[PDB]
Structure formats: C-alpha cells, structure tokens
Write a protein that binds this ligand. Structure first.
Ligand code: HDD
Ligand code: HDD
Lengths: 727, 727, 309, 83, 84
C-alpha cells in the first residue's frame, strides 16, 4: 500500500506551529523532545505503528482486514472467525463509565517548580528546592455535562493537578472559583442531582438554567456565593489559560518542627483573566462545542504554553477564629486584601497526551492524595470528599488497581502488602503479603515521620465534642460573601451578573421559584435584586425593599482581586485575529498586519467566502484558512479588514454579519481604507468610536491601536450601543 | 522491625532442593537463573520488597501500619484516614470471578522445542526449527470444583498450554482424556450444570457422584465414552506429571503449499502414566486438598521438571471418511493402533510463578488462539468453544484488554486499530485508529499469507448444506468406543472402573437413575453391567442380558495404549518414600536406604511420633520431617521401616495404621530386621509375599527390590488380599 | 423424550422427611406451607418451570436445544445462531467474585421473636413486642477457604443473621467464638493474608497450619486468645446447629429516653454445644466436604429446625 | 455484558419480555429470578424435562431457522456483486 | 494485655478439651516449615500457661529454657480462675 500523499503533507511538522497551520497530532509525535520524568516513564506503554504488521491482540498477523469469514462470498458469517470477534469484542467494550461530575474535561502534561525552598513552613518534598522539578498532569473541566457536552457552557470549571512528587502523588483538585456551593459533603448528591439534567427526561445538558437547580438554590442560601460567581462572566471563561484556580478548602502545611499552618491554594493565570460574554459563549456551544479543548491543545502545539503561578494564602494556627467567617467553611472565601497570596512557584503545561482515552479519560484525581508536609482540616465538605474519590473509580476504573493505569502511576517507589484485584499488573515477588513478617525480614517496612523521606503522620489536632450531625453555627451566614463579591465587580460585570440571573430564571418554568430566588437576592443587594426582578416582571415588596444588607467582611466593602477586569492584567500572546480577505487585497496592509501580530505572538486566520486562495494586488498568493461562516467571529479575539476590492465582499451578508457579531460581542475591530465602508453595517459614526480602529491604511500606528485594544480584552464602553444592532 | 532470625533460616536456598527441605518460594527467588523470553519479558512488572519503604499505592510512606487514625486512642475512626481506606479498599476488591469450569488449577512456566522441522506439513513458526525455543505457560486443572476445591477428586483434568510464539500466542487447551462428554457446544451448559453442584443447595463439590450428573448421562448416551474414562483410574491421577494430555478435537495443519492435514494433539508424560486408587484419592482430598498443586510446585523446586512429549495423530484429507466413526466427533478417539502418534517435540516445565493470582488466576487460555499453519475443523464442540473463551474473560478479567495482563501478553509484536476499553494499558501514538487510512500511511498494515511471517488466511474448505440445527447421523453411535476402552484395560483396571461406577451410582438417591445407567452399561459390555448391577443390588433383565455388544472399532478388539498400566512405563524419579523412624535407628540401614533413593532421584520423608530429632545408634542426629499422622501414607509412594528399637513404635497405633493404609492402597512396603514384626499388622505370612520387601538389614538387594516395586507403581496382585483388612 | 419414571419417584414428598428418605429440593417445593413476610415477598421473582415452554431470555420458544445452527449437518457453526450465543454467553458469565473472607457458607430462612418487650433498654422495633415476628435469613460460614472449600476444616465460623425489621434491616454479623484475632481493622488485610493460602503458590486451602499464619501469630500476641479458641474443639463444630454465636464487639442499646446501655450479643444453640475431634473432622473434609451444608439443609427438611436463643 | 453489567440485562425492567420466559440458564451478576426448577439442565427426568422444547408450527411453535442453501468455500471475500 | 484471656480460656476447659487444644497446636506447628516460628509460638504459649507450653513443646521436640520455665503466669480475669 501507499495511501499517504507523495508530497508527505499528511504528517504534521514536529515543530511548534500556530493554530491551524498543521493537522494536530499526538503529543509525543508533535513534540518528541519535550520531556519530563513522568512522560519518559510512560515510554514502556507507548505503542508505535509505522512499519508494523496489523495483528490480533494475540500477535497474529491479519491478511484481510476488510472481510468476515463466510461460507461462499455471499454466504453466512462463520462462528470460527476469531479475528472478527476479537475486533468487534474490543470495539463493543470500549466505553467506561464517565466521571459522575466533571465528565467533560481537557488535559495536558507539564512541570512545576518552586521559586524558593518552603522548608520553613512545609516539609513537602516537592516544595523544598527551586531546582526540584515536579512533573504534572492537569485536567481542566466543566461540572454538569457529560463527556460529550460542550465546553463554553455557563458552569463552574474544575482544575485538577496531579503532581508526581518524589514522596508520592499529590493531587490538588480545585476549581476556578474560591468557594463551593455547599458546606457539608452529605448534601453533594442533592446539589449535583439538582443541577444535572432532570430525572424524568434528562434535560437540560450542560446548563443550570432549569427548575430543579434554582429550586435547590432558593431553599439553600449557602449556595448563593458560588451561584454569584457562576452567574458572573467567571462562569464562561475565554479559555482554561485565562481563568483562576483555587483549592477552595483550608488545608494545612506541616513543617519539620511539626508546626501546622493553615493554607488555601491558588493558581494565578500568567496569561491573565479573561472571559467570553454570554451570547458569544452560548453560540460557541453550537459552532464549536470543543472550543476550550481545541484552544488548550492548539496553544501547547504553538508553544503558547499555559502557565500558572501557585500561590498560598497562609494563616497562622492562632488566627483561626480571627475572621468574621469560619476558615473551614467552603462557601466562604479569604479576601486577598485580608490575607495576601504568596507566590510559591510556577507550572507550565507544555505537552499534549498521545491518547485522550488512555491518559485523560482514565486519569484519577483525588484530594485525599496528599504527602508528608500537607494535612487536612475539618472542613465538612473536604472531609466527605475524602471518602468519594477512592470509592468512585472502583466502578469508573474497574477496580482497586487504578493506580497501575499508566497515567496514574507514581514516579517514585511504591511497595506494600496489598495484592490481587481485577487486572493486577504488578507481580509481587515478596515472600510475605502481610506485616509484621519475619519471612521477608518485615520488608517493606514502616518509616517514622521525619524532616524528609519519613512516613505520613497526621497533625495531632485536638478533637473535642459530641458525636453530632449538626452544622456549625459559625457556617450559618450566607449573604456577606455574595455581597462582597457583588460590590467588587465593575459596573459592566455587575450587569452581566444581573443578565446571568435574569436569563437563567426566565427558563425556570415554576414562577414561585423565580420569586424565591429574587427574595434571596434581596438579602444580598437591593440593586441586584431590583434589576433581576424587573427583567422577570416581578415587583419587590415593601419588606423586601427594607431588608438590611449583610455586614462587610472584616471591614471590607470590596476587594478588587475578585473582579476579572477591575485591575488590568491582559496578555495578547496566544490570542487570534480574524482577517477578512477580498479578491484583490492591498498586500502592503497584510504585510504590516502580520508582522505586528507576529511580534506580539498573536495568531491570524485568513478568511474568505470560499476555500482555496486569493491573489493580492502584487501577485502575493494568499491561502484561505476558512470561510466567514466556517470560522465565525466567536472563535477569534478581534477582526481586521484590510483594504482592497471591498465590493467583492461589501454585499456579502456573511462578511457583514461577521462584523456585527464581533461588534455585539465587544471585540476590537480594525478597518483599513475602503474597509471603512463596513462602518455603516455596525452603525459607526463618521467621526469614529472607541473600540473601532480605522485609518487610510493598516500601518504601525493602526496595529498599535488594535493590539492595545486586544490587551484590554473587550470594549466594555460599547455595551450600551450593541442594544440597537440586530445580530 | 528486624524480625528475621539471625542465621537466615527464614529464607530458602536459591538452588534445587528436595520436597520439604526448605520453605517453598516464588519462582524468581527460588531459581533466578532459570530464564526464558517470556520470564524475562515479565521483568517490567515484577516488584521486589527487600529494603523498600512501606507505602500507599500512591507512593506515600506509611509511618504506622498497625493503627487506624482516631480521635483519641480509644476514640472513633476518622473518615480522613486515607491510608486505612486504601488498604481496606484493595482488600475488599481482591477477588475476581473464578473460571466457569476448571476453576481449580495449578500452573508453571517452561519451554518447548521441536525435534525436527515440521515445514513439510505445517508452516507454524514454532515447529519450523529444532533450535527454535518457544516459552510456555501451562495450567493443569480439575473441571467441576471451585478455585478452593480439592485436587485429588475423581474428575477429568484440564491441560492447557500457552505457546508464546514468534507469530502469535498459540493456546493448546486440552484434557487428560482423548474425548469429551458431549458432541455439540450448545449442550455445554446442560452438561456442566448437571455435573456441577445442584442449584437448590450447591452440593456436591468436586464430584459427579450425584443424581443430576447421572440423570444427564442416562439420557445422553454420547457421554458414555468420557464417563468410562472418568470412572477408570484415569479420573484420579497420581500427579499432573503422570497423566496423558490430548487436544481432543481434530484440527488442521496447513503447510506453505496450502495443503491441509488433519491432526489430533497428544502429550506423552515422560514420567509415565500413574494414578491413585479411589480410597486413597478420596481420603487424600481430606488430608491434603492441595496435593497436586504442591507436588507440581515441589517437583519444579527439586529440579524434577515435568517433561512432556508433544505428539501428532496425522490423517490425510483423503482419509476423512475411512473410519467407523466421524473424525469430527469429539466423543470418539482415534486408536493409536490405527493412527500412530508421531513424536514432535518436548515440553519442559522448569519454573513456578512468582504470584499465583497475577500469573495463574489471571491467565486466559483459548483454543481459538491459533497461528498461521494451524486451522480449525467443523467439529461441532470445537466450533462453539471458539465463541466462549473470548467472551468469558469480559467478566472474568474485567474487559477486552485482558491480553494486556502480563502473563497473557504476546512476546511478539502486536499492533492494530483497537482502542480504549477498561484498564487500557497501551498508549497508542498512531495518528489513525482506523484502516484504511492515509494519515499514517495505512500502518499498521495487512500482510498476505506466505510460507513464513505471513497473515492468517483460513483454509478454503468447501461448505455445502442447508442451514440446519442437526446432529450429523455419523455422530449417532455411542457404545463402540466405551467398549473399546473397556476391553483395553487390565483386569484390575476393569475392577476399578466397576468400583467407580458402583460407588458413584450409590450416591444417586433416585434408584431409577441407577437402573437406567445400568441399562446403558449393558449396551457396552455385559460383564461390566453385571458387575455394577451386582454392587447396586440390581438384577439385569433377560432382555438386557441379550443386548448385542457394539461392533469393534475398525476391527480392533483392544488397544493397549488406552490402558494406564498394560504397557509398563514406570519412572521412579520424583516419587517419595515414607521412612518410619524409631528412637534408636540402625544408622547403616538408613545410610543404605537414603543413598539408594537419592541415586534414583526418589525422595524420602523421615517420620516419627513427634517432631524434633531422634538419635541413631551411632549418634547420628536425624531430623524429623513430620509425624505419622502429619504426613499420612496417602502422600507417599512406598513405605520403609528400618531396623532399630522397634518396640519404640511397635504398639504405636498410627505407625501400625500407616502400614495398613499403604498396604491397602497397594504401595510397596519394605521392612528391615525387627521391622518385620510389623508383618503381623498387615497379615503377612512368614515366607513373605510379592510387594513386601524383607530382609535382615537394608543392605544387598533390599533397595533394588524395593525400587523395582516402585517402578511398577503399585502391587496389583495384592488386590484380593485387601478385600478383608480393616483399614 | 427423557421423562420422569412412571411411579413419580423422581419428586420428593412435600412433607418433613428424615435425611436420606427423599431427594432434597428447593425450599418452596419441599415446604410450600412454610411462610413468613420475607419469603412471601420473594414471590415476585420466583420462577416455576413445570408445563412451560423452553425459551430464550427474550421469550422466544426454542425448537431444538440439542444442536447449534450450521451450514449442513457436518458444517461450521454460523454466527447467526443467537439461541446458541445467548445460552453460551449467560453460561460464560455465571460467576461473580466470591466473598474476600467467609466465601464458604450455608444459609437458611427463618423467624425471630423476643420473649418480652425490651423497651426499657432499647427502642429497636424488632425487640419491642413478644408477638411481633421478624423474618430472618442466616448464613453460617468458615473464614479462610474458597466457596468450593470443605466444611469441617479447623477455622472460626461466621454466624450472620439478617433481620428484616419494620424499621429497617438489622444484620447481626458474628462468629462462633466471642473474640476476634486482632484489635484494629487496619490490620485485617495482614491477618487475613497471613491465614489465607500463601501468595506464591496458593496453598494451603482452609487451613491455618502453615508458616505465614504462625509467623503472624508469633509476632502479634493479641491473636493468642482467638487462636486458643481455634485450636480447641470450637474450631471443628459438629454442626452449625451445635455451636455458639457471638457478635464479638460491644455495641449499644438506646432506649426511648436516650439512655445508652453497652451490649454484647450471644446466640445459644438450643441443640447444645458439640464438636468433632480433629482426625474425624480432617477425614470428613475428604469424605464429605459438604457435611455442614448437607446437615443443615437436611435438618430443616426433617423438621429439626436449627433453634438459637 | 459491560454496558449493562452482565448476562441478566433482560431482567432490567424495561428489557423484560411481557410473555413467559423459562430456561435452564442460571446465575450471572445481579440475578433477579429465583428458579425453583429442581433441574438446571436438559434433558432431565427430575423435573420431567420441563421447561420443554416446542416444535415449530403455524402458531406458538419453536424457532427454526429457514433452511437456506449454503455452498461456497470458507473465504474472507467481498461478493463481486457488492462492488 | 494479651495472655490473661487465653489463660482464662485454657483453665476453663476440661482435661480432654485441654489435650485437644494441645494436639491442635502441635499438629499445626508441625506443618510450619521454619522451626524458629514454632519456637516463637511455644515461647508465647509459656506466657499463657507452662503446662500447656510444655505439652506442645514436647510434641515438637522442643525443650523449654530456664527463662521460659520462669515466666510468671498472667493475672486472673477480675479474680476468675475459671469460667465453665
Ligand atoms: C462528596 C463527594 C464530592 C464532593 C463533596 C466534591 N466532589 Fe469533586 N468529584 C467527586 C466527588 C466529590 C467524585 C465523585 O469522586 C469525582 C468525580 C469522578 C472522580 O474521579 O471523582 C469528582 C471529580 C472532581 C474533579 C475532576 C478531576 C478530574 O478532572 O478527573 C474536580 C476538578 C472536582 N471533583 C473538584 C471538586 C471541587 C473543587 C469540590 C469542592 C470543593 C468537589 N469536587 C466536591
Ligand atoms: C462452549 C463452551 C466450551 C466448551 C464446549 C468447552 N469449554 Fe473449556 N472452557 C469454557 C467454555 C467451553 C470456558 C467457560 O470459556 C472456559 C472457562 C474459563 C475460561 O477461561 O475458559 C473454559 C476453560 C477450559 C480450560 C481451562 C483453561 C485454564 O486452565 O485457564 C480447559 C483446560 C478447557 N476448558 C478444556 C476444554 C476441553 C478439552 C473441552 C472439550 C473439548 C472444553 N474445554 C469444552
């Protein structure tokens, strides 16, 4: 055979290339020289293909992989066809149970490294030296939808990091918001059932916009804080690279002296914080349900590695009760104004998996998986999580040997007296399978706790109280965090929150549920409550108007670190610009455009009304990446329309629609020369409008203005104008 | 802690040692220099223990593995103890479904080598060159009992060989009898359910002596042939090393020219044929239910490797219909007087597993696993077996990735487009997961059939007929093979057959089922039927007395290869002798005894009334292996009582009974000097009797005479003398 | 064809009979008049058979259950034989994992009744009224051996009772000795691995007489008390009917006023205490490995109902 | 077998036939039906061979495949007619 | 505390039950291949009762040492010297 093109254009270059320049490929084929201990340790299970014979799983070479064995060429299939049955059997049992929650997720390999030794506060080996590099495997996800659901839904996002340390696996299993919806793990199934697709008909997918979710929320005010984050633009991240990461729970750091420090974990996106806008997000679920997964994969293939800074919020054991909220309450955040995040290290995601199923689908992350130098706390949510993540992979991963599945395997030594279990891979040669034993001289042996390489010993926390199924009275406050969050948002962010609640409650069929949720909003903020209420045709009562707002959180009336956009931090490297072509493009414009974009690491997609190519005025042949309908503006960060034969595209509905959609969604638009005639379609004044770059040609100044707008992400001042544009 | 004894007696020497001298141990530790390609390939999953820290499965060192974490040293266990939960979770899910049949089995590693190239008749790579060594993994089994059932039951024995070839796994899945009970795979569940423990109460275990088995047998005369084999001494082998092995079905050998030759597979025991007697076997299921498993393991540790000769019954395509019976009928054997077994190669079993569960319990054998050069036939039992063995491991071994379990893995390459499935180990890098493809240039690729290393192509057998659920009329003859078997047995073998049937039928509660089986036996042979009938207090009718016997099998009225003992093949190496010690043994006898046994590779066990030591007449200190009750005569092949202070054990009931039991079970007994006083225990006349060695001392010909008796296995002339004797 | 004898001697009389008098049979056929709420509640899943057509699991009548479908009567079996594949598939997947411990067990149905109300010390509904009957299902077992191992081995015996009460299931999961070998559950896998068949070769079955168990015992003196009981004749009971039952642990009884009372549970065999002797027990594992299972079943069929206080 | 956990998936409510189903198959993970048949095999005399085979007939008969004519060699080959 | 209950149990058995206990330990320990393990168990029996320890030791051909012969029996269980 020889089906590959003789030119060799079926195989992607094994060099970093921008999004869409090459066909994407398995990580080790795309970047074979990107290495880490974990990645190298997976080499024993990696399987090639080129130059090998096609075989059964038993190693028997197949002569004909096109036909079943039958009596005569139009006869009955025979039961003796073992080649067929093995192929079909494997196919028939390919699927494993998806994750109960966070079933939809995207993952990649990377490495972590500390900025300095943290031996003074923790004896955790991976944090003991800036030169200790710890391989990681990070899986990002949504919560509600199945594995086949869409990425840009409105939802909380999971952020799990598997650290392959030299003293064991440490899984930091977090999310993109600093709190969770509920306080006690016992209500998790109630919350999840409430948000998941309703039981009779299994609708709706990937959405909290339905009766049962809001019913539960209305009856459980502890959920309001995380509900606020979800209704904000935090619920619709632009990309996994541009969202924050949090551990949520107060854990402990244990140093060598055996002193405990309370800690909350943080992931700071070095690419900055950025989110889509609701209409763009929702339409993106239909145009490209794999948008986040694609974006992550393509950023890593282009060398735009997602980078996060690990940060710790540290609270002395003696300060436990110094806040007006309980440190162990997962529905409560620790304002960065009160307890600053200490920048501890950096994680770089630099390599995609080879096989999604094998590495991503099969990975098992669990918050219980800690290492010496780390310890839990009594947070009632975290406490109950500890039972679950081991339990769940008995079905999901088929048994108790899930740690032998390659991606889950520790890179450090593991030895114990545990044996058997379905699909046992390890063959134990130990004469003994119990301890204490004399027949193997008691090996493997226990190790006393110590400064380094010691066994795990729990912090000896004093436990005093009666066996009671009771919520701590201290956790009984539900509106102050929500209010703090609300007051810390910019005016447009507040407006998107109001719109989030209004859109969702509009889809709640039982009107009394909408009213009860508006009543909860009145205990948080009158302005929020009135604005949502007015969109629902609901009138606040006398009493609702008089509810006194909750108290500030330890004197804070706001905290700018809770806003996505209050404090500038945008990064354009890795963003993408759509360039709308015409049949005789002014080649000088493009040249300048592309040069400026490449200098800032911004990608471009050349779009036209058909595939193939167009020729610029000087004979420059320009390859078309996609059509206007084929790669909608939802997929880009800004739109540029170069000068040339504008009449070729000026009556192109799709071309005009491309600009109106981008406009509606507050994206920077740049118009050069006669591309300025497209101003009429988005009704832009003759004199101009902030957010629309326009010039006689696309020069250095023009590119500087566009790149400046892209660093600010979206044109928030345009909001009050998109109302009157039909798109 | 440091619990092994200073002196290192906890650890067995890593060199061949006779049974009972050292603690048995994992194969890789007992014989580290015994290697093969498969054993070396398992090194990636072998795990050590010594000098390693005790950890969780995630690599975290454990400080205290004696206690659960609790609130107070007498307080409640906390949910956060993940070390406790992981260790209990693995324990809680250790078991996997046992095999539906053959659940009880003992396995070992070894190697195979052909004597000469078989290229003229088969293109199978493992038979193409005498210098080609093929690693094997053999599992011997019983059929009916569960994994924890006993070894020396009356049953058929399984004999499965996994040939790790260069062109794929070849599994030869046979038994210790040349036929099976049924003709068509559709009745397998019927037959098995009938023989297994009855469904209301799950009784009995490891036995066909119950109503449902004999009910089925009486209604399905096709089973009579294999029933005859089971009722004979063949059903209670002395050990796996001393039984024959057969593939049962007629398969095909395909050469490079495309010529098909019919073949039946045979295994000849190089240690010979040898079985126990019913009373010993049944009692031995009580005194040591692991007798076969232990004997196999210890033979390999002593260096007495089980050796088998692969042999082929070869029948040209033109002779398919030249016999009285159908070649495709699995209830019919091919008499060696008609078609000789041609010696093909030697299999040597020379290493035990490291971990029984990982290697033995998870091994999956399947007769559909063939390689180019072999093919199937239309044998209706075999046809259906091809469906079952892949199917069953979806539950037994948790999925379709069972070939990725270390023991099952091919040693040769395996590449295909199958993906995912529970427990997926292999991480595929192939850009394509389908064929035909151009994106990976169609790799891996199909390979045409050819003389060597070519793809599998089935032999183009002509198929002609209507789609029918119909037994071929050529299969409808049920008594001629049973009769041929009967007539080929010695008189004492025939008595033992009569005794097996009589005993089994006595456990059948409904008398009419006993009568119906007696009626079937009368269709086979009158003498046989009459003798069984007599033992059951049943009178044959005149009609039954004149049933004309089935015809000879192609003129044969007997075939001595069908007997275990008609044609001598006695091997004494690996056998064991019990030595009844006293407190002042004549050391000269002992030296003569022990050295004669060692010269022929016959083992000995020194027994006494307690453990510890005994001092011979010259001060030689004798180590006691076991007490008379601790290692009953059932476990040895012969008994020797050396001269000394005989009055020390003369009135010891156990010692006396030891000789009564061995005498009854027809084992050679040797009495030196005053040990001849024991003759009155077994009723031996002054002049002596064949089967009893006796002299003034253990000198001269005493040991050569005893060893000749051992070579003939049992004293069959003593049968009439055992009738009375209360033992 | 193959039918019952003319005399109807294929079927056991549906009345109490002495061991050996009639072939044993499923409980609802042997004693149709013996009922209790649990037994009646199982009627939705009980399936008869007499007078019904043989079918696939999809309810399709089978014409020929003697043969596979093939192209010609000496031809290859065809893949479209769904009757055959359904039948084989079900057979191929009959086994389920046996219990990690106590895999070998024998069970029966019964009923419990308190002698008097125990409301002063406990508000448990099943102990509140002398005339309120609670259906039970009891499973007796050995500890070490597989489900196919022998009954009369030397081992501890499990004595599990499932109480179907009006306020929930109560499982009293005990043993025939009043203590266990170890103190903390974290060591369970160590103890069980030590007594179970050794890992390299999986020997010995249903026996503690091997190096690893005695090694563990020798380094863990807390096991000595239950080891004493195991080595005594308590380790080889004559029948499940003639052994004591104990819950081992101290639990609590809680009354309606909130008072907690510490309790240890006992079962007293009304047939008395009786054990075999070692030689007998060992030989019996060979002569009848199903002796305790058989003896329990036959006692019940005979009207000699196992009774415990 | 993997999707619905075993060979008793016909006992899952929605999959249950509404007509009678009786056979000699037993056990399997999550076995719902409790068989009282003394026999779990056929032929059997202990339950007088019930449940019994049923000859094919016009109505309520056993399934019998159409006796189609088969003739050709054992081949892995696409029919030329499909090309 | 590991020996008082073992001893309470031992003293509560009849003479023939005590012998059967002895025979059980002796049988079992005879199947233990590593002799040091048998000796360690006998040592543990000497912490329970010397009559018992000595009867097992004799069947195993083991000699109790002088220190073993001088191990003080465990205390009675709340004054009980037996419980029938
Ligand atoms: C009581 C149980 C429970 C509770 C209270 C939580 N979840 Fe959880 N979560 C699970 C039980 C669980 C699970 C059922 O065990 C899962 C799903 C599948 C799995 O492997 O683990 C899991 C998965 C899972 C994952 C996906 C890991 C991966 O990508 O595979 C993330 C990121 C989180 N959860 C994070 C959270 C956050 C940050 C929580 C609150 C702080 C939360 N979980 C509470
Ligand atoms: C159609 C069903 C079928 C039929 C008719 C047979 N069996 Fe089979 N056999 C089974 C279905 C099966 C099985 C259910 O698939 C088993 C259970 C466990 C497994 O892996 O394979 C098995 C296992 C099994 C093994 C044990 C493999 C091991 O040690 O793991 C032996 C040696 C054989 N059988 C031998 C045979 C021979 C000689 C038989 C007749 C020629 C036969 N079986 C008929």
């Amino acid at each position: 055979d020889s089906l590959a093109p003789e030119d060799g254009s079926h195989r992607p270059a094994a060099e970093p290339t921008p999004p869409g320049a090459q066909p994407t490929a398995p990580g080790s084929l795309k970047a074979p020289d990107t290495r880490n201990e974990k990645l190298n340790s997976l080499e024993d299970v990696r399987k090639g293909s080129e130059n090998y014979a096609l075989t059964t799983n038993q190693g028997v070479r197949i002569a004909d992989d096109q036909n079943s064995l039958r009596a005569g060429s139009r006869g009955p299939t025979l039961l003796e066809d073992f080649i067929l049955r093995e192929k079909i059997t494997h196919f028939d049992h390919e699927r494993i149970p998806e994750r109960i929650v966070h079933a939809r997720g995207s993952a990649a390999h990377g490495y972590f490294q500390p900025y300095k030794s943290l031996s003074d506060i923790t004896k955790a080996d991976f944090l003991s030296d800036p030169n200790k590099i710890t391989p990681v495997f990070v899986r990002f996800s949504t919560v509600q939808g199945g594995a086949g659901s869409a990425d840009t839904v409105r939802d909380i996002r999971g952020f799990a990091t598997k650290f392959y340390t030299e003293e064991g696996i440490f899984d930091l299993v977090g999310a993109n918001t600093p709190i969770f919806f509920i306080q006690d793990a016992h209500k998790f199934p109630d919350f999840v059932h409430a948000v998941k697709p309703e039981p009779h008909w299994a609708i709706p997918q990937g959405q909290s916009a339905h009766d049962t979710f809001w019913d539960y929320v209305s009856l459980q005010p502890e959920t309001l804080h995380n509900v606020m984050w979800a209704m904000s633009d935090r619920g619709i991240p632009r990309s996994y690279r541009t969202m924050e990461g949090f551990g949520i729970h107060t854990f402990r750091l244990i140093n060598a002296e055996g002193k405990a420090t309370f800690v909350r974990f943080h992931w700071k996106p070095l690419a900055g914080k950025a989110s889509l806008v609701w209409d763009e997000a929702q339409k993106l679920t239909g145009r490209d349900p794999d948008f986040h997964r694609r974006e992550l994969w393509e950023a890593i293939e282009a060398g735009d590695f997602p980078e996060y800074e690990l940060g710790f919020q540290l609270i002395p054991e003696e300060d436990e009760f110094k806040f007006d909220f309980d440190l162990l309450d997962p529905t409560k955040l620790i304002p960065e104004e009160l307890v600053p995040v200490q920048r501890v290290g950096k994680m770089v995601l630099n390599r995609n998996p080879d096989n999604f199923f094998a590495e991503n689908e099969q990975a098992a992350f669990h918050p219980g998986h800690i290492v010496p130098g780390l310890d839990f706390t009594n947070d009632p949510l975290l406490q109950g999580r500890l039972f679950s993540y081991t339990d769940t992979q008995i079905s999901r991963l088929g048994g108790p040997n899930f740690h032998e599945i390659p991606i889950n395997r520790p890179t450090c030594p593991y030895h114990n007296f545990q044996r058997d279990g379905m699909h046992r891979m390890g063959i134990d040669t130990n004469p003994a399978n119990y301890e204490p034993n004399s027949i193997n001289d008691n090996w493997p042996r226990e190790t006393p706790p110590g400064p380094k390489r010691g066994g795990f010993e729990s912090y000896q926390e004093r436990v005093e109280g009666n066996k009671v199924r009771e919520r701590s009275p201290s956790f009984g406050e539900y509106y102050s965090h929500p209010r703090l969050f609300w007051l810390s948002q910019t005016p447009f962010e507040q407006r998107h929150i109001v719109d989030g609640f209004s859109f969702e409650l509009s889809k709640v069929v039982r009107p009394y549920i909408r009213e009860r949720v508006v009543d909860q909003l009145a205990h948080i903020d009158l302005t929020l409550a009135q604005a949502v209420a007015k969109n629902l045709g609901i009138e606040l009562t006398d009493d609702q108007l008089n509810i006194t707002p909750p108290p500030d959180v330890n004197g804070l009336k706001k905290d700018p670190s809770l806003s996505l956009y209050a404090i500038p931090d945008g990064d354009v490297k890795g963003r993408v610009v759509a360039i709308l072509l015409n049949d005789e493009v002014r080649s000088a414009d493009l040249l300048a455009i592309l040069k400026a974009l490449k200098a800032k690491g911004v990608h471009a997609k050349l779009l036209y009304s058909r595939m193939g190519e167009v020729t610029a005025d000087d004979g420059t042949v320009l390859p078309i990446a996609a059509t206007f309908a084929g790669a909608p503006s939802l997929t880009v960060d800004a739109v540029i329309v170069p000068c040339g034969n504008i009449a070729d595209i000026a009556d192109n509905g799709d071309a005009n629609y491309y600009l109106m959609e981008a406009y509606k969604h507050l994206k920077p638009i740049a118009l050069a020369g006669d591309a300025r005639k497209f101003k009429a379609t988005i009704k832009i004044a003759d004199q101009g409008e902030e957010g629309i770059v326009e010039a006689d040609s696309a020069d250095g100044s023009f590119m500087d203005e566009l790149l400046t707008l892209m660093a600010a992400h979206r044109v928030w001042s345009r909001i009050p104008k998109i109302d009157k544009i039909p798109a």
